[PDB]
Write a protein that binds this DNA or RNA. Sequence first.
RNA 1: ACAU
DNA 2: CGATGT
Length: 136
Amino acid sequence: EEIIWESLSVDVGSQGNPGIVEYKGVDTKTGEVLFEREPIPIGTNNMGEFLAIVHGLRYLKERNSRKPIYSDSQTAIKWVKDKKAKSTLVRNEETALIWKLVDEAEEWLNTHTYETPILKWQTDKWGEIKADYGRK
RNA sequence: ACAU
DNA sequence: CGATGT
Ligand SMILES: [K+]
Ligand SMILES: [K+]
Ligand SMILES: [K+]
Ligand SMILES: [Mg+2]
Ligand SMILES: [Mg+2]
């Protein structure tokens, strides 16, 4: 503890896993939605969580903001730190789009810098992350 | 087991 | 109940 209220919170939403994947980013203090990704027909929860963090890094850098990012995904936080999304999702024609976005997000991480702290949202102490979709 |  | 991940 405790919550850094001056932050951006991100989360994935899906219809199936693998299935249709979307994500959004919100102001932790207010819940204002700051970005939302158009649904991607097939992806995994963890690919979506990864894309959401990277989009948040890009969003904050473009705006010269030093705010931290909260994610509830141990996996996606590690993948961003490693600059490598270690997804098991088959690469085929159906999954081409999500894998293109994941590849492009890795490419961005490998060509840009950032100081943004990427913090674990402590769901067991604080309840659901503010960017949650309410689908569970 | 933990995080989704 | 099923799936994605460390
Ligand atoms: K949900
Ligand atoms: K959760
Ligand atoms: K498991
Ligand atoms: Mg989540
Ligand atoms: Mg959620």
